[PDB]
Amino acid sequence: TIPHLAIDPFSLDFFDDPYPDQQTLRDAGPVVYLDKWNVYGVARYAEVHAVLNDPTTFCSSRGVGLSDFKKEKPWRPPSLILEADPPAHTRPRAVLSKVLSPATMKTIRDGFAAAADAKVDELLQRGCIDAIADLAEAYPLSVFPDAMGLKQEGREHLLPYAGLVFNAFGPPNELRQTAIERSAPHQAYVNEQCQRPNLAPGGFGACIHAFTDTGEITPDEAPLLVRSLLSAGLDTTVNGIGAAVYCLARFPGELQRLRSDPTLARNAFEEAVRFESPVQTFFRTTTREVELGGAVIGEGEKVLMFLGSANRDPRRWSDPDLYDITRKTSGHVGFGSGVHMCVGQLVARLEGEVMLSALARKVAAIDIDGPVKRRFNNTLRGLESLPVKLTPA
Ligand code: HEM
Ligand SMILES: COc1ccc(/C=C/C(=O)O)cc1
Ligand SMILES: [Cl-]
Numbered sequence: 165t166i167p168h169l170a171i172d173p174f175s176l177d178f179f180d181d182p183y184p185d186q187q188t189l190r191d192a193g194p195v196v197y198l199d200k201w202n203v204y205g206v207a208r209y210a211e212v213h214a215v216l217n218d219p220t221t222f223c224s225s226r227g228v229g230l231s232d233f234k235k236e237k238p239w240r241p242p243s244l245i246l247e248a249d250p251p252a253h254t255r256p257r258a259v260l261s262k263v264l265s266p267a268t269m270k271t272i273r274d275g276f277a278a279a280a281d282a283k284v285d286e287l288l289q290r291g292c293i294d295a296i297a298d299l300a301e302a303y304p305l306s307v308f309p310d311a312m313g314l315k316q317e318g319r320e321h322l323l324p325y326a327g328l329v330f331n332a333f334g335p336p337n338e339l340r341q342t343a344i345e346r347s348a349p350h351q352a353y354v355n356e357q358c359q360r361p362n363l364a365p366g367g368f369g370a371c372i373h374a375f376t377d378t379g380e381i382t383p384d385e386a387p388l389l390v391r392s393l394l395s396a397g398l399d400t401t402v403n404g405i406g407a408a409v410y411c412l413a414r415f416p417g418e419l420q421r422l423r424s425d426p427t428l429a430r431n432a433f434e435e436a437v438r439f440e441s442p443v444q445t446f447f448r449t450t451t452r453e454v455e456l457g458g459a460v461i462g463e464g465e466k467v468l469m470f471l472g473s474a475n476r477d478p479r480r481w482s483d484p485d486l487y488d489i490t491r492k493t494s495g496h497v498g499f500g501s502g503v504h505m506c507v508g509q510l511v512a513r514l515e516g517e518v519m520l521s522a523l524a525r526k527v528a529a530i531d532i533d534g535p536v537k538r539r540f541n542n543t544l545r546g547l548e549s550l551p552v553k554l555t556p557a
Contacts (some may be wrong), residue, residue: 166459167192172200173445173468174334179540182444183485186473194457201230201335203447203466204459209481209497211457212474215448215467216501222448222467224504225249229333229447230466239332239344240351244388246396250503256389259375260507263368269510272311277518279307284522288556292533295413295550300406303519308398308511312390313367314357321353326399327541333446334542354394358387368393397508400442401515403539403546407440408433408520411487413530413552418489419523423557426524432489433516438496439487441472444545446500471497472545529555 169192171185172178178185189196189207196205206212215222224247227233233242242248244256262268283303287293301323309319328350331343356362360383363369369390376383412419412432422432450465461467474497476484499506506512523530534551 166195166197166204168197168199169205170199173198173205173470174201174337174339174542176540179545180538182472182545183476186470186476189470190473190477190479193459195459195461198468201466201468203230203468204456204461205468205470206456207470207473207477208479209474209477210479212469212471212497213495213501214456215469216497216504219249219503221451221454223249223451224448225252226449226464227447230335230468232449232464232466234449234464241388243392243395244385245392245507246504253503255380256385257503257507259372259380259389260392262375263371264508264511266510268368268371269514272307273514273518276307276311276514277521279303280515280518280522281526284519284526284554288526288554292551292553294534295409295530295552296402296406296539296547297549299409299519300402300546300550303405304398304401304515307515308401311368311511312393312397313364313369314394315362315364318353318357321350322394322398323402325350325354326395329395330399330443330541330543332542337542339540339542354391355387357394358390360386363390393508397511399544400508401512403440403442403544404433404437404512404516405519406546406550407442408436408516409523409530409552410547410550411436411439412520412523413532413550415487416529418487419527419530422489422520422524423528426521428489429520429524430513430517431491431493432520432524433513434493434496435487435489435491436516437498437512438475438491438493440545441475441498442545443498443543444472445470445543469497471500526557527554528557529553531555 194211198205328343328347331339334340360373372389373386376386422428448467450461452463454461478484499509531553533553537549539546539548
């Protein structure tokens with residue numbers, strides 16, 4: 165009773181324009197079977213939300229990529245947070261929640277906002293820039309490694325490592341093979357910086373190690389928790405901020421509404437996360453036979469959740485293909501939902517808000533003025549190059 169589809173959601177053709185295929189995935193049924201990779205798929209909001217919020221049935225400890233850790237060796241030691249179920253997940257989650265807490269945002273906000281304002285003013289002196297390399301990448305590179313407390317040496321490995329991280333959740337296609345092959349130098353750099361002596365006191369990494377005193381994590385758990393932030397904390401925000409600028413460039417009416425009320429910056433970024441869904445997909449693995457939308461899925465099956473499709477499902481969203489900075493976005497699954505919901509969401513929103521605030525106060529127009537190039541990744545959606553001309557307000 166389950167429709168079988170041949171759509172490859174990790175193919176370059178799909179990445180290049182996923183929306184027609186996502187509708188076919190939604191409209192085929194609440195649950196589909198993807199013959200290309202032998203996994204189940206859910207693409208509607210209701211089922212994606214249900215799977216995310218049913219962690220005892222749809223577990224994370226067998227991996228959140230295609231690979232089943234019960235069957236294949238993980239490419240690196242399993243994540244203590246992303247690839248753990250409760251109760252093992254709980255205390256590492258609590259540490260990260262405290263390290264990336266509301267109280268912590270107060271300590272970094274002035275620096276993050278200052279860097280965003282300075283970057284936009286710098287770009288306005290150049291006129292014609294690449295909104296990826298010069299903005300979406302440059303700005304997070306200017307604040308997040310420092311907030312982590314990383315040394316200067318080796319930071320050139322951060323974006324390559326993240327590309328590997330997010331390609332590795334995918335199937336064994338060319339993107340994944342090429343990423344994992346000869347990835348040892350990227351892994352070695354990151355694993356070295358996770359050690360306590362290499363992390364600046366006061367930064368996120370040192371604060372993680374400081375929590376080993378409390379009994380919430382052991383000293384040998386702290387480097388892997390630092391690793392989780394170096395895996396997820398940079399490339400996500402690159403594609404989130406790039407998504408927002410791409411939206412503002414394509415919807416000039418919405419840039420003008422943002423200009424008229426810069427306090428819409430935070431929601432304008434949140435809507436960009438829904439609209440583009442920089443993190444497109446994650447998997448779960450069934451721990452038991454389970455009925456889901458009329459489908460009876462066996463134990464030990466991989467289930468692919470299309471977060472971006474859920475965020476564009478007209479069953480849930482009015483006018484889902486419209487970028488609307490005053491939309492009530494609560495309930496979107498671009499940061500996940502439930503026990504694994506993005507623990508770094510305050511850092512992501514802070515970066516996005518202060519950058520969009522700077523644009524709102526300083527920029528009158530954003531015009532695409534060069535060839536746009538898409539960046540292909542098994543998990544991340546975003547652009548490789550976005551040439552724009554910025555007109556000062
Ligand atoms: C626009 C930016 C971001 C997006 C769209 C995003 C997306 C997501 C999603 C969808 C999940 C859920 C994973 C799952 O359910 O399996 C997640 C979890 C996570 N994210 Fe974020 N993320 C972003 C930024 C960040 C930042 C800035 C950090 C760290 C500074 C971070 C660190 C993490 C970690 C450690 C987890 C694992 C949480 C857990 O398993 O409990 N992410 N993210
Ligand atoms: C939202 O994407 C991600 C990606 C990776 C991770 C953790 C990685 C690790 O523990 O090494 C967490 C979230
Ligand atoms: Cl690693």
